[PDB]
């Protein structure tokens, strides 16, 4: 219900991307069970578990607070094809639940929802999409020839 879904604005960089899909940066313990509350089904985690800020078991955390984990880590100086791939195939097995794909800050896990969103035909917008960017894709040359990449390799 509505009050549930107003109740996921404290988490760090929450973008809700469709109404089955939230991007975020990193929800603190508490805040996974208010994404349970709000109907989340699976939480796929970007954020490299070798991070200093990250859950010591963030499965631990996401299975506790009943839900699906889904652990896709991407490197941020390095982004790979196949884990795009990875995560198209996570949401294809996941198809019709709610999730959430996350990272710190929201720049991995908006970029990866821009991709799936664009090659699922939805004819995403760019900016709309990658807001927590704040415009600095330009910034990150290996970004952006993913997403160049992906792009093109999926039709667009
Ligand atoms: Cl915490």
């Given amino acids: 219900n509505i009050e549930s879904i107003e109740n996921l604005q404290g988490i760090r960089a929450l973008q809700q991307q469709?109404?089955?899909?939230?991007?975020?940066?990193?929800?603190?313990e508490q805040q996974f069970s208010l994404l349970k509350q709000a109907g989340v089904d699976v939480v796929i985690n970007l954020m490299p578990d070798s991070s200093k800020d990250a859950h010591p078991d963030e499965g631990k955390l996401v299975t506790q607070a009943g839900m699906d984990y889904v652990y896709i880590p991407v490197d941020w100086q390095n982004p790979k094809v196949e884990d795009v791939e990875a995560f198209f195939a996570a949401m294809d097995q996941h198809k019709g639940k709610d999730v959430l794909v996350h990272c710190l800050a929201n720049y991995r896990a908006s970029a990866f929802a821009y991709?799936?969103?664009?090659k699922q035909g939805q004819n995403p917008n760019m900016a709309?999409?990658?807001?927590?960017?704040?415009?600095?894709?330009?910034?990150?040359?290996?970004?952006?020839?993913?997403?160049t990449e992906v792009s093109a390799k999926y039709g667009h």
């Avoid at 927590?132 to 020839?145: F, G, H, R, T, V």
Wanted: hydrophobic content about 45%; overall charge negative; glycine content about 2%.
């Fill in 115 to 118: 991709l799936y969103q664009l």
């Fill in 18 to 28: 469709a109404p089955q899909l939230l991007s975020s940066g990193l929800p603190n």
């Fill in 128 to 147: 709309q999409t990658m807001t927590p960017w704040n415009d600095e894709l330009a910034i990150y040359p290996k970004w952006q020839a993913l997403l």
